[PDB]
Amino acid sequence: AYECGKQGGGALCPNNKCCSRYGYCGFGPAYCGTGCQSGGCCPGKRCGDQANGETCPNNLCCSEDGYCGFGSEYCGAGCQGGPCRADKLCGQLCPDNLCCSQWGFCGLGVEFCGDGCQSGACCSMRCGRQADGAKCTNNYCCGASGYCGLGGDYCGAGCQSGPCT
Amino acid sequence: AYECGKQGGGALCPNNKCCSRYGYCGFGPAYCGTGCQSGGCCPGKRCGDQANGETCPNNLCCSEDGYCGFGSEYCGAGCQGGPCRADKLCGQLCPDNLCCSQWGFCGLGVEFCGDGCQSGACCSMRCGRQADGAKCTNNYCCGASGYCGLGGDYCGAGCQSGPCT
Ligand SMILES: CC(=O)N[C@H]1[C@H]([C@H](O)[C@H](O)CO)O[C@@](O)(C(=O)O)C[C@@H]1O
């Protein structure tokens, strides 16, 4: 019956809905207040240096203060995680499975994850006996067909390397 | 069993994991490719003026070309949705349940959702009998104790106004 959070297999709610302390999605104090697990918590969840390096759920920005939110106060000056307004360099894996482009910037979409993708959620990164025993980055699994990814198709039967089974 | 997407009650995957066409979380072509429902799809999901105004799942940015992603190309110049780098004015709701601050900026966190919050996922916007019949915004439900919100705690038993069930 649970929807989200520790009760719901780590799932997030859609459209910034807060995950209550009991693992259901909604807005208002019962969801976003004390115990809020993810979404638009109020106050924002603690993050970055102020929470042992934990990133914000739902790709919220981690403020200079170490709270999760959106707006200039969170994503602008002093932003330490999430979709900060500053370009994010990599080479230092991108946080939260963002793709490190060939040019060493973090992002998502084909410009980052496609041709030349170094690491993160790359579209099509080869591995295993199909790619000279090449290893996957980010501790992903090498699927039977020699593609890097996560989930049953890559970590399940036929898995060549990484955290198989 | 299912984790995400239509099959998983509209849940999102954590850490930008892609929701496959079958409603499971992962990375690689099976999850992020054709039929990808959310997360770091490759290519990014269509959005904005290229998807009938649909916003990106997981607070991804909608590029000027109508694809979901992160990075300068998506959040920077031409961004039409998500956590664009430009400040977003309001007064005129915010998208994706973002709070409209008393000053007329969209965001999340106390500076937006706290005192003076006009709309969206406000921390503690009073309503109903406790607020002299005041109505909630965003078609939220007024809970029994007179706070605006969504979910069973606000739209369920005791719901005063809004789309009670
Ligand atoms: C996919 C990627 O890395 N794109 C980055 C590009 C590339 O480095 C190209 O080399 C420059 O066009 O550089 C930027 O400064 C840019 O021009 O916007 C940031 C952008 O995120």
Ligand SMILES: CC(=O)N[C@H]1[C@H]([C@H](O)[C@H](O)CO)O[C@@](O)(C(=O)O)C[C@@H]1O
């Ligand atoms: C890409 C994807 O969603 N794969 C999932 C598959 C698909 O649902 C079936 O291949 C559809 O026929 O089912 C699993 O139980 C599996 O076989 O391990 C989980 C796995 O994550």
